[PDB]
Amino acid sequence: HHSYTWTGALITPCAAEESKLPINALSNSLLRHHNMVYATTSRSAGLRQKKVTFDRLQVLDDHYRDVLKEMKAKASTVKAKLLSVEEACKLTPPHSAKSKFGYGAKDVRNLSSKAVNHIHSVWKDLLEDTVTPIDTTIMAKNEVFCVQRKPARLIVFPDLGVRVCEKMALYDVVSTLPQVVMGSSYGFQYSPGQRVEFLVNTWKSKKNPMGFSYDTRCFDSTVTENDIRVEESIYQCCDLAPEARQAIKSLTERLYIGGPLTNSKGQNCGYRRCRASGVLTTSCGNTLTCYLKASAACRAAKLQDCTMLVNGDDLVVICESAGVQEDAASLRAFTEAMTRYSAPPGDPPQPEYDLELITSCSSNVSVAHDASGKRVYYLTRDPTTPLARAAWETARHTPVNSWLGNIIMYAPTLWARMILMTHFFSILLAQEQLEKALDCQIYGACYSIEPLDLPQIIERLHGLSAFSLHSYSPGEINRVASCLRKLGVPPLRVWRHRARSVRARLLSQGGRAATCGKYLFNWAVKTKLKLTPIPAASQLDLSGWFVAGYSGGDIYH
């Protein structure tokens, strides 16, 4: 029951790869310690292969089957529909990897005859053959980090034609099923502010709360054939068209359970028998399987009143404390059960009695104060990776602008406001690119966003308090400060001056640009304006932004 087997052929790049942080004339304005930033490359793929390759054992007990039955009962209330070819085509990102069969993402999006004809042939083949494993490509991801180096993560994905078919069969299911099965525990239904609200309300709902995060070691590799078939059994509980049932069975047998791995050069690299990281069902399947295992483990451990919050392989549990000693023992039992279910821990979980000390989805709840002095809870994170990626993006145009996604998701934070907003608006001004739409990712889905729309987006997501937060926590201030020292980022006085300059220039432009100046940089001036609701904010169609997770699922909006 190996997660992978390997032929010895290398995982190869499909283009030139850089590992060292590229530098231009703008780099120093953000950070001086350039050697601390690196990107992963295929050169480290072998190290990753070694980490992700291991035998899985699974012992499934009555708690597991009990929880599964309950999940299936909820799933049976879901009705899901097939997407049309056109609907599925329109969800394809403009720069998604081209097919090996003579067409690309633009052809798909334009409903070209060649592309649509091929998609039809793939769909027909799915209905007629439920056995033959479908080819996948394995690649080493190029991702940017700060030292202390990680080996490249791997991505495994089927051809463009297949991806469109996955959407047709499964887009409605993976968008709808998780919240029905998991209710308030499904993390992707929340904006950051809503996630904070759920965490705080859950913490407050306990008489004596205790909470912990649980990090499964290499989660995708721990997912077994059993788990993937159990996932299919949950999808099949839905009210589906018979054609959809067949396509779902077929994709499960031929793609989700496993298949051959082919490198960028067309050589056979080996064989996968665990979760593929680059299929439509990666996020939903991981979320369901993590929730199933954790819920059963809570019962095995006799944790009291467990409330889960699950986002793919990311897990937070908040429960009723039974005492420090009892809590620590129950957590060990929980871990032993997760391990039996094939979800052993990377780092051992630890009980926390302060909500702000639990880190999940790389984030934590913190507190600051609004203009009226009231306490506001908001979502933050360690800014190291955001700033490292920001430095790379300062010198190179990249397919996904992490800086933009980070401003959107972390708008209320000390670091996103002081540094990211100031730095990138300065750059946009200089190049007169304020109006140019840019791609970013939210919960794995790709969105094209104009930076001039940021104040409205931020108001809709976080409320007006996002523009007035101050008196951040000492813990949060200290964490930011340490990061700035580590990377060699300029001090607050510098950022405040740059912000006043950016603000002034934005104001003189009028229109949305002036709105950006007024709202984003009100923190930087001596005499603060009293900010009021932006009229055009309600016009944004944000329905669909925080419904589901789509990491690896090739989704665009």
Ligand X SMILES: CC(C)N(c1cc(C#CC(C)(C)C)sc1C(=O)O)C(=O)[C@H]1CC[C@H](C)CC1
- First-to-last alpha carbon distance for the chain, in angstroms, is 38
Burial pattern 375-408, b for ≥16 Cβ within 10 A else e, equals: ebbbbbbbbbbbbbbbbbbbbeeeeebbbbbbbb
**CA 140 to CA 555: how far, in whole Å?**
20
CB of 481 to ligand X, least distance (A): 4
Candidates 19-27, 139-147, 226-234, 472-480; binding stretch for ligand X (CB under 6 A): 472-480
CB of 474 to ligand X, least distance (A): 9
Nearest to 259 by CA among 153, 118, 157: 157
Q: Under DSSP, is residue 445 helix (H, G, I), strand (E, B) or coil?
A: strand
φ/ψ region of 472 (left if φ > 0, alpha if ψ in -120 to 50, else beta) reads beta
392 or 523: whose CB is closer to ligand X? 523
Q: Is 147 in the site for ligand X (CB under 6 A)?
A: no
- Taken as a whole, the chain contains a residue count of 557
Report whether 314 belongs to an annotated binding site. Answer: yes
Torsional sign, CA 52, 57, 63, 65: positive
Tell me, by CB under 6 A, how many residues bind ligand X: 12
CB of 467 to ligand X, least distance (A): 9
What letter would DSSP give residue 186? B
Side by side, which strands form the sheet with 209-215?
Answer: 209-215, 314-320, 304-311
- Tokens encoding 478: 């200290």
**CA 538 to CA 545: how far, in whole Å?**
15
Q: Is 472 in the site for ligand X (CB under 6 A)?
A: yes
Q: Is 414 in the site for ligand X (CB under 6 A)?
A: yes
**Strand 4-6, strand 268-272: pairing:** antiparallel
Q: Is 418 in the site for ligand X (CB under 6 A)?
A: yes
Interface residue with ligand X among 51, 470, 485, 497 (CB under 6 A) is 470
Candidates 35-43, 392-400, 467-475, 535-543; binding stretch for ligand X (CB under 6 A): 467-475
**CA 131 to CA 250: how far, in whole Å?**
7
Q: Is 477 in the site for ligand X (CB under 6 A)?
A: yes
Candidates 277-285, 342-350, 458-466, 478-486; binding stretch for ligand X (CB under 6 A): 478-486
Interface residue with ligand X among 297, 480, 502, 506 (CB under 6 A) is 480
Candidates 63-71, 116-124, 212-220, 414-422; binding stretch for ligand X (CB under 6 A): 414-422
Candidates 53-61, 179-187, 305-313, 471-479; binding stretch for ligand X (CB under 6 A): 471-479
175 or 465: whose CB is closer to ligand X? 465
Q: Would you tell me how many other CB atoms lie within 10 Å of the CB of residue 431?
A: 9
Report whether 347 belongs to an annotated binding site. Answer: no
Distances (CA, A) of 88 to 97, 162, 169, 352: 15, 11, 9, 44
Binding marks (x or -) toward ligand X, 373..412, rule CB under 6 A?
Answer: ----------------------------------------
**What HEC string does 24-70 produce?**
CCCHHHHCCCHHHEEECCHHHHHHHHHHHCCECCCCCCHHHHHHHHH
Candidates 25-33, 172-180, 424-432, 466-474; binding stretch for ligand X (CB under 6 A): 466-474
Interface residue with ligand X among 417, 423, 503, 512 (CB under 6 A) is 417
Interface residue with ligand X among 324, 492, 494, 536 (CB under 6 A) is 492
Q: Is 523 in the site for ligand X (CB under 6 A)?
A: yes
418 or 457: whose CB is closer to ligand X? 418
Report whether 453 belongs to an annotated binding site. Answer: no
- Going by the annotation, the residues of the binding site are 215, 313-314
- Going by the annotation, the residues of the binding site for Mg(2+) are 215, 313-314
Residues that bind ligand X (CB under 6 A): 414, 417-418, 470-472, 477, 480-481, 484, 492, 523
